[PDB]
């Protein structure tokens, strides 16, 4: 906006305090620059009525939709703190919840269902997915409702999510089972080889992941029982035996180069 120089950008000098031209040094503009309330408790007793009650208190109207969003965010925070999620996933969950709530398509379902569905979406989109059963453990909602709500969120908000692979769950399962790094690497190699070689058509990745856990567990000094595997994975012991008896042939090929048998 420099005179005598049409179409000239002005360098803003936050130290010298001016707006300055890189052809002639003129200055345009002499200097540079740079909803509610709460009513608390009364201090003096002069505000109290004959029955007390202080006569002056916060009405806290703040619309209905803002109240719904605030309760939903409280539910998201107290849900994600239980499995100890980092706050980036919480903020992404809040972003998805606000987009869904302003999309105005899922009024017919409990806000808590949309909340846990957005938690699942945000856990998926960071490359650290949780299982549906892990979300169901820290939520008051059945697996059917969260599945249907997840199906409606992906249909409505028009986004694509990456398909889960077995290797994402391996670190959480081994670490929560307190297994060392060699067990981690061996189990991940077993899971990825079993996926790629095609022993398991249409099997869920959670079952073969826990099967790889059982592989790496029943080959070293430390050993884990079927019940512990089902406790940490959520898959039933029958499903572990199904995956065991179907993965057991061609065992040395699935193992890595060295494991110290």
């Amino acid at each position: 906006t420099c005179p005598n120089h049409p179409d000239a950008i002005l360098v803003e000098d936050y130290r010298a305090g001016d707006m300055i031209c890189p052809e002639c040094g003129l200055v345009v503009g002499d200097r540079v620059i740079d909803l509610s309330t709460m009513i608390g408790k009364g201090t003096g007793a002069a505000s109290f009525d004959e029955f007390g009650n202080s006569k002056y208190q916060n009405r806290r109207t703040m619309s209905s939709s803002d109240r719904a969003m605030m309760n939903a965010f409280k539910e998201i925070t107290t849900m994600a703190d239980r499995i100890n999620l980092p706050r980036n996933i919480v903020d992404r969950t809040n972003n998805l919840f606000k987009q869904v709530y302003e999309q105005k398509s899922l009024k017919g379902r409990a806000n808590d269902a949309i909340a846990s569905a957005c938690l699942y979406i945000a856990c998926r989109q960071e490359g650290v997915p949780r299982t549906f059963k892990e979300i169901c453990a820290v939520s008051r909602i059945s697996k059917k409702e969260i599945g249907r709500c997840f199906k409606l969120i992906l249909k409505a908000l028009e986004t694509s999510v990456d398909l889960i692979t077995t290797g994402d769950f391996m670190s959480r399962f081994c670490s929560n089972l307190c297994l060392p790094k060699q067990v981690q690497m061996a189990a991940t190699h077993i899971a990825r080889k079993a996926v790629e070689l095609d022993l398991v058509p249409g099997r869920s990745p959670i079952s073969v992941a826990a099967a790889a856990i059982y592989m790496a567990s029943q080959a070293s000094a430390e050993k884990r029982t079927q019940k512990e595997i089902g406790d940490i994975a959520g898959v039933a012991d029958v499903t572990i035996r199904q995956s065991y008896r179907l993965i057991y042939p061609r065992a040395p090929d699935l193992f890595p180069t060295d494991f110290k048998f």
């Binding site: 740079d34 909803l35 509610s36 309330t37």
Partner: protein, 50 residues
């Protein structure tokens, strides 16, 4: 006795920065929003008839 409340201009109660997209307002702006809300509520409730 006041019957009209003079709202101060944006120079008296300007908006401050933070990271940027906040554009936080002065405390006078927030209280005046509250004043306008309560005054509008009273003005409608005068003929709504509580």
């Amino acid at each position: 006795i006041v019957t009209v409340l003079p709202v101060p201009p944006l120079s008296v109660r300007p908006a401050v920065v933070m990271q940027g997209s906040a554009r936080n307002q002065d405390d006078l702006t927030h209280k005046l929003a509250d004043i306008v809300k309560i005054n509008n509520q009273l003005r409608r409730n005068e003929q709504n008839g509580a």
